[PDB]
Design an enzyme around this catalytic site. Structure first.
Site, PDB file in Angstrom:
ATOM      1  N   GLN A  60       0.815  -1.209   0.000  1.00  0.00           N
ATOM      2  CA  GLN A  60       0.000   0.000   0.000  1.00  0.00           C
ATOM      3  C   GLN A  60       0.853   1.265   0.000  1.00  0.00           C
ATOM      4  OE1 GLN A  60      -2.767   0.727   3.418  1.00  0.00           O
ATOM      5  NE2 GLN A  60      -4.274   1.036   1.783  1.00  0.00           N
ATOM      6  N   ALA A  98      -1.101 -10.539   1.892  1.00  0.00           N
ATOM      7  CA  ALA A  98      -0.322 -11.398   2.774  1.00  0.00           C
ATOM      8  C   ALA A  98      -0.698 -11.232   4.240  1.00  0.00           C
ATOM      9  CB  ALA A  98       1.172 -11.123   2.593  1.00  0.00           C
ATOM     10  N   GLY A 146       4.751  -6.173   1.484  1.00  0.00           N
ATOM     11  CA  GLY A 146       5.915  -5.390   1.100  1.00  0.00           C
ATOM     12  C   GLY A 146       7.226  -6.113   1.345  1.00  0.00           C
ATOM     13  N   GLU A 203      27.291   6.498 -10.272  1.00  0.00           N
ATOM     14  CA  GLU A 203      28.119   7.400  -9.479  1.00  0.00           C
ATOM     15  C   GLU A 203      27.624   7.467  -8.040  1.00  0.00           C
ATOM     16  OE1 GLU A 203      28.375  10.858 -12.514  1.00  0.00           O
ATOM     17  OE2 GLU A 203      30.275  10.920 -11.414  1.00  0.00           O
TER      18      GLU A 203
END
Ligand code: GTP
Ligand code: GTP
Ligand code: GDP
Ligand code: GDP
Ligand code: MG
Ligand code: MG
Lengths: 100, 430, 427, 430, 427
Positions: free
Chosen positions: B11, B90, B137, B245
């Site tokens: 989310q 989940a 996540g 870089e």
């Protein structure tokens, strides 16, 4: 708070979920990004280190005027033959000689 | 050209991206419908007929977060493929989102990423957003990075994650997801940025003129940092910095991969009109502990890396004056083996504002990234939190039944300890 | 006639070279569309030195642009004088330079080396009177530090007799734009010492110091810094393009200034330098130029000669001046400052005169010298590199590209040998 | 170019500052909005565009006084960060204002003052205002000097405080606050001036033509003295005097800094029509025992310091005659240790008149700053008043219960006793 | 020809210098913008003495302005003749000195000394033949005294041969502007005795007295007070700037007037001085100038020479005059005043004539002499210094700057020796 009170106030600003709101004054909404710089490139001193030697250093002239030399004016007035005071001025007023 | 790809899981990651693509659309002048009323190639693809498409794919295991974009005004821009969503989240479980449910849709996500990779002529990095406490996540992101590591290999994998707050916690099993995810990132991620919610709340209360902000305010602040970071490639600048870089300068060690982010100026809608906002002023505001995005005091450690990107009205001469002044501060401690300390980049694009926004309309702004040992304090809090409940085995059975083998918990615990030992060893002068 | 080929191996050199060709086009009078629109026949005398003529009166420079990423070329192509360059004289990679010396030299260096040497051969073989090579690069970067030395080694193998003169920007003493620069300069010097014939060192902080003190620029931009560097670079080749009463070509400058093969690093300086508003107060004369040339506040390198002693030094004058005062001033400056020069080289200084001064100046001068003050510059990077030695762990970033750790020890031993070399020639 | 900074503590300090910045704006021609309808850099800074800001910070432990400025017309000129307001005041308790509550906000004020000095390049000096009777003024002033003394070292710290009146008083615990404050400023203050409200009332009545003054009129008189002192730093003159000049001249030792002040002419806006008030006229009026704003007897007080700041219209010859004439008076006895005993400042700038004010429109005026042994008379009155209450332990329990140790009372009593002994020793001949 | 470099220190030095260069510009006829609009070719003979010539027909005065605070600098810039001075000649600090001599010498003098010395050397080596330095300072303590004496020593180290002629305004010994004068004056005299060659003492009270007695000014303004000192300054150097029947430079004055190295302090005076109204009725001749010069009310040092005795006396004249008249007048005054001269020096009065008089006056003169009347000034400041040192008041400021009180004893020992040397030489 219009359901209980008549409100026209500035200092005690109520908060709002998205943001507090303004107390001072501001210029237009989107405007005024802050404190710009300034620049002056290398090229201009390249020009001036030459051209300072040039014309812009010329001195000022004098605003001279054609003021009469009365002595030489009287010489010409006498030579022409002006005798009376009024006729003396007539020649003296018209046919100037600027002072050397 | 040269291209970047953005991936969002959870989310928080999607809503942060929602703010970012608002900021990019306005910055380049792209209407939400994809038409014009430039440098699109850095983030957008010209599909012909005047329409543009972003280089991003959204994946959430539940449809609620993605359905917001589908039913919103944003829907005309994104390709319907880029709006992948599942039908079962989940639910704050790492094992559930990594084994039982993650493998159901991971192949679908990878195929669409590779399809997008075909159009990227100069693909030189990825942007991935995580929510460490979340089950989706952390679990899905762990599987995605491990797969993407072998799919492409030598490609930059930059992460933008949200760390659990020191005291504010929305998930009870949050440290369990945090440690296991951290153990997986630490071997694959090139460099992962670190932010937390509590520092965002405190900063928005004090500096900005908002008293009780929402998630929209927090995401917009993060989105500005992303735009400032990506502005070096997108636009001409006096000192352009490449993603690689950043990789060489920001992480000058083996596995130390967690810097902190700061942004200045962050001023109200009226004090900017009342203030100088000089180069020296904004530079000094960066190093003050009150302005950081992570709640950790630098006085508990030292610095070993700094990276300053200046967007706007900024002479390089004042930049040299600013950094030289900073080195004079005794309150800031630099390690001995980093005399250079700094990477600077100067870009001519001014900061971007949003209608109905939260920020000022300044002519110059600076984004700051620093790697420091102060983040080791956060690891100690996370480790102690994990040890307390695992000693009594507070939530073991929920993970075990969902595909977790119990032997992995001590392995991740030992991996975090090695990170702490590595962090402490680097801080010792030699 | 007396041709030179200019190589912009780095993104910084592309910016500096861009401003450089504006200066040269201004000096010879080249219109921004590539057609000559000057004011004198003397400009077309030796235009072959720097330009080739295409059928139609359009003049094209002998320049090549090299980079690993296409970021800088877009700026130069959109620049004011971007048209002048040859469309086929743009060489760029399709990967991030990464600011890494080893990665730039090895990974993408071998990929681009085959092509860039072939493109250079177009200019090298098409000039009969060629004596000159001009490389512009930065030492703290990723495409000039590594790839520039790669081209230098290859060109030395190809054309041993031609002069390899390069211009370099050194990392600043106080703060420099990148964390890993001390490694990058350390690896670059090892190749530069053996291969290059003439090395010019320029520092950005010294340029800032000069601008704020003398020019009083309250906001000096990158254009001002590049202009000062372009001024010194343009003055050096002035003898090859215009008549002069006492000529001094590159080989003359090399023979006079270089006593030994390794001690050939040069400091640069230009005169006159004056505040924009104070120039009218100045009686610009040769002694004033001599005062500025030897002034300790005009060199583009932040190294005090007074802390050391002087090796051979040279001075080049442009403009209508008589000889005698030039001879007397250089003789007096040598006799006045005996302690700073070395006795075992009589006549430590060299002089030269060119007829035509640059545009906007009735006379100017260029100062090029060599001294023992360079050891402070090497001490700066050496002291940093010594603490970076504990970050031989950090060198794991370099070995990932393919480099071996023993190269770094080889390079630092080279500076240690070079530092001891300067110390012993002080006696 | 050359700069000053001012801090105001307590309602006495803030209300004094309100009038002073009224006076500066009319003198410098700046509207209350900060926009013009020079020497601005000494007191003001240009915030870009067309707005100015003052170099002042207002601090107090109660919000009422600060809120009045936030509600006043001058609310627009001041920057919101400069206005710092506490929660609960010291309640006229030195211990409460120094330890319990003062330490809560002290770090916040110290950050803002140091931050403002960053824009202050040519800075020498600070102006701090105290209310000796009030607990917050004396208590917070001690702590602020203690921190500022070590943070900045050798910098001119000059204060403008209101000394307790010999008989007029508004707080019963006033002597306790003054002695403890005197113990702190005697070491942490370079030089501080004092005035008392009793003599201000008397001068506002006899020479001035106000039958019944309020605090606003007294503040305006104080502001005029402050304006005269800072006139040299802002305008050219035949004899300019810097802050460092005042410190060197006024004091012969370390602990004898305390000067007295005088201003002439103080004739009213109505009565002044009849007098030309030449140089000799104004010079004689200064040395009158009635023109002092400290109720001390000049007979008991020998002079070993003087400073003549002339504003308006003067030619230096007239000063030399006036000074020589004053030296001939037998009643005005200088000490043997000070033959010269004079600093004079001749400045071209005439004084300023405020609409709705009380002072005359004088063409020339002179301000006096001198150190005399008559100040030792006031110390004895304070010493005896403290002894009477502490003999029966009148108010010990309040200060002890607020974190202050009992043994600090004899310490400050001995410190004051040393000061009186030093004054007697110096006043003695040799 | 024979050049002099002018240095101005602090507040008092700059205001006098502003008036001095106004007078000098009037003498030579230089417009405030720098153009020459004079009337006589004789002005151009020795314009090189005080001026450098800038290309474009503009002249830059040989003036270096020195301060520790910019307040006086800004006043000079806004002045009428501030445009003449070279912008880089302005050297200033960012600190009010505070008139602490220890502070002005050690704390802030040292850091500004390095920059000032190089700025001085810029003009020092820009002249064909330097002969002496001209310094204007006040004995206050901050910059005129502390930094002034520091620069005097450094110039003595650099140029032993050249004449370091300094002009000093002693604190007025009845009313003066700071309590720390005896400390600063005693130390300043200590340094000025050994390192300076010619010291000219001027008292403000005598300047007030002269304006009242002779000029009948209702109020002496600082502009006119500085004007008289500037007039005396120009008369001293007038012999070098214009021809005459009997020349006398600074070195001639020093050799004639100074019998012994320490006793070299001088009192100065000017004539003719006349009110704005009564100048029409005056019959100005040589005897009139002689009467004014030897008048005790026209000597601008407030120490009556009649109390003491004279040692040497010098006279300058400006205008076409008979040399016999001058010789007779100097003999006339010498024999009449025989009770005021030493027996062992015959011909105590020197004379000199300059061809061109100052503008406005057909005739002019300037008196400079040495006498034993200086014993009073040193005695007065010694008594004040003795009191304050006995109490040891005000010394804590000087101690904090690192000056130890034993330095005060050395300075008084030198001052007491100077007082003694004058006393026995009176016999
Ligand atoms: N800065 C910021 N953080 C957010 C925002 N929204 C959510 N978060 C944080 O991100 C975390 C999201 O994790 P979860 O609530 O478990 O949702 P998820 O990532 O899909 O994980 P599961 O739904 O349990 O599978 C929350 O705990 C919040 O702390 C946001 O809008 N801005
Ligand atoms: N001249 C003058 N004096 C004032 C004014 N206001 C307060 N005072 C003095 O202040 C003293 C009272 O203490 P406060 O002003 O309250 O000082 P404070 O710092 O606020 O201390 P507390 O209120 O006790 O916490 C009195 O003795 C007054 O003499 C004023 O407007 N003008
Ligand atoms: N003076 C100057 N220096 C520059 C400019 N552009 C880049 N640089 C310097 O070059 C360094 C970066 O190195 P890099 O560009 O990778 O070197 P290159 O590969 O040779 O171009 C920075 O630290 C800058 O200091 C410019 O326009 N002027
Ligand atoms: N004659 C004269 N004296 C001045 C003038 N201005 C200031 N002074 C004197 O100069 C003294 C101050 O000297 P100052 O410049 O401060 O020296 P410093 O303190 O050592 O730097 C004071 O005593 C003044 O009396 C002026 O215009 N004319
Ligand atoms: Mg989440
Ligand atoms: Mg109060």
């Amino acid at each position: 708070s219009s359901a209980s009170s008549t409100v026209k106030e500035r200092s005690l600003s109520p908060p709002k979920t998205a943001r507090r709101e303004l107390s001072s004054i501001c210029p237009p909404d989107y405007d005024e990004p802050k404190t710009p710089k300034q620049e002056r490139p290398k090229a201009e001193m390249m020009t001036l280190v030459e051209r300072t030697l040039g014309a812009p250093a010329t001195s000022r002239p004098l605003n001279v005027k054609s003021n009469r030399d009365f002595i030489s004016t009287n010489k010409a007035a006498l030579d022409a033959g002006c005798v009376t005071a009024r006729d003396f001025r007539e020649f003296k007023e018209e046919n100037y000689i600027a002072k050397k | 050209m040269r291209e970047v790809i953005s991936i969002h899981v959870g989310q928080a990651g999607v809503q942060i991206g929602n703010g970012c693509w608002e900021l990019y659309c306005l910055e380049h002048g792209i209407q939400p419908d994809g038409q014009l009323p430039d440098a699109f190639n850095t983030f957008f693809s010209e599909t012909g007929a005047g329409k543009h498409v972003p280089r991003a794919v959204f994946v959430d295991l539940e449809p609620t977060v993605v359905d917001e974009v589908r039913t919103g005004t944003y829907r005309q821009l994104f390709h319907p493929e880029q709006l992948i969503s599942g039908k079962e989240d989940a639910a704050n479980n790492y094992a559930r989102g990594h084994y039982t449910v993650g493998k159901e849709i991971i192949d679908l996500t990878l195929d669409r990423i590779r399809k997008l990779a075909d159009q990227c002529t100069g693909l030189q990095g990825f942007l991935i957003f995580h929510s460490f406490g979340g089950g989706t996540g952390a679990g899905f992101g762990s599987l995605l990075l491990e797969r993407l590591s072998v799919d492409y290999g030598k490609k930059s994998k930059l992460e933008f994650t949200v760390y659990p707050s020191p005291q504010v916690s929305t998930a009870i099993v949050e440290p369990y997801n945090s440690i296991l995810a951290t153990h997986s990132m630490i071997d694959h991620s090139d460099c992962a940025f670190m932010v937390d919610n509590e520092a965002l709340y405190d900063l928005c209360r004090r500096a900005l003129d908002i008293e009780r902000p929402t998630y929209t305010n927090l995401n917009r602040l993060i989105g500005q940092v992303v735009s400032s970071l990506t502005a070096s490639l997108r636009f001409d600048g006096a000192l352009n910095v490449d993603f690689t870089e950043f990789q060489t300068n920001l992480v000058p060690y083996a596995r130390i991969h967690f810097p902190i982010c700061s942004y200045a100026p962050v001023i109200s809608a009226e004090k900017a009109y009342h203030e100088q906002l000089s180069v020296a002023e904004i530079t000094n505001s960066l190093f003050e502990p009150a302005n950081m995005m992570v709640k950790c005091d630098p006085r508990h450690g030292k610095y070993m890396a700094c990276t300053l990107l200046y967007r706007g009205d900024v002479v390089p001469k004042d930049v040299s004056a600013a950094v030289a002044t900073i080195k004079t501060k005794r309150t800031i401690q630099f390690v001995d083996w980093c005399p250079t300390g700094f990477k600077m980049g100067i870009n001519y694009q001014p900061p971007t504002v949003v209608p109905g926004g939260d920020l000022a309309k300044v002519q110059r702004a600076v984004c700051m990234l620093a790697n420091t040992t102060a983040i080791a304090e956060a690891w100690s809090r996370l480790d102690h939190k994990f040890d307390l409940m695992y000693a009594k085995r507070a939530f073991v059975h929920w993970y075990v039944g969902e595909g977790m083998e119990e032997a992995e918990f001590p392995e991740a615990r030992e991996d975090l300890a090695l990170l702490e030992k590595d962090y402490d060893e680097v801080a010792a002068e030699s | 006639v007396r041709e030179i080929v200019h190589i912009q191996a780095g993104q910084c050199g592309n910016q500096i070279g861009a401003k450089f060709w504006e200066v040269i086009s201004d000096e010879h009078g080249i219109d921004p569309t590539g057609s000559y629109h000057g004011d004198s026949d003397l400009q077309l005398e030796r235009i072959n030195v720097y330009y080739n003529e295409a059928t139609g009166g359009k003049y094209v420079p002998r320049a090549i642009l090299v980079d690993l990423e296409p970021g800088t070329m877009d700026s130069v192509r959109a620049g004011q004088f971007g048209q002048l360059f040859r469309p086929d004289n743009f060489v760029f990679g399709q990967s991030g330079a990464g600011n890494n010396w080893a990665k730039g030299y090895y990974t993408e260096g071998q990929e681009l080396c085959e092509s860039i040497l072939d493109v250079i051969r177009k200019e090298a073989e098409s000039c009969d009177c060629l004596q000159g090579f001009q490389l512009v690069h930065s030492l703290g970067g990723g495409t000039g530090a590594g790839l520039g030395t790669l081209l230098l080694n290859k060109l030395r193998e190809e054309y041993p007799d031609r002069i390899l003169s390069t211009y370099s920007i050194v990392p600043s003493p106080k703060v420099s734009d990148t964390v890993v620069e001390p490694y990058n300069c350390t690896l670059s010097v090892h190749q530069l010492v053996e291969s290059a014939d003439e090395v010019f060192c320029i520092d950005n902080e010294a340029l800032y110091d000069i601008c704020f003190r003398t020019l009083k620029l309250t906001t000096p931009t990158y254009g001002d810094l590049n202009h000062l560097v372009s001024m010194v670079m343009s003055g050096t080749t002035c003898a090859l393009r215009f008549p002069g009463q006492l000529n001094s070509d590159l080989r003359k400058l090399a023979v006079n200034l270089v006593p030994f093969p390794r001690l050939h690093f040069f400091i640069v300086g230009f005169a006159p330098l004056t505040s924009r508003g104070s120039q009218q107060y100045r009686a610009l004369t040769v002694p004033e130029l001599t005062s500025q040339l030897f002034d300790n506040k005009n060199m583009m390198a932040a190294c005090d000669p007074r802390r050391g002693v002087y090796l051979t030094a040279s001075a080049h004058f442009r403009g209508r001046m008589s000889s005698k005062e030039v001879d007397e001033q250089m003789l007096n400056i040598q006799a006045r400052n005996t302690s700073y020069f070395v006795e075992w080289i009589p006549s430590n200084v060299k002089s030269a005169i060119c007829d035509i001064p640059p545009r906007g100046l009735k006379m100017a001068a260029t100062f090029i010298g060599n001294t023992t003050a360079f050891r402070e510059l090497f001490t700066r990077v050496d002291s940093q590199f010594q603490k970076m030695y504990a970050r031989r762990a950090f060198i794991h970033w370099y070995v990932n590209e393919g480099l071996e750790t023993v190269e770094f020890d080889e390079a630092r031993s080279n500076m240690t040998d070079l530092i001891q070399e300067y110390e012993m020639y002080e006696t």
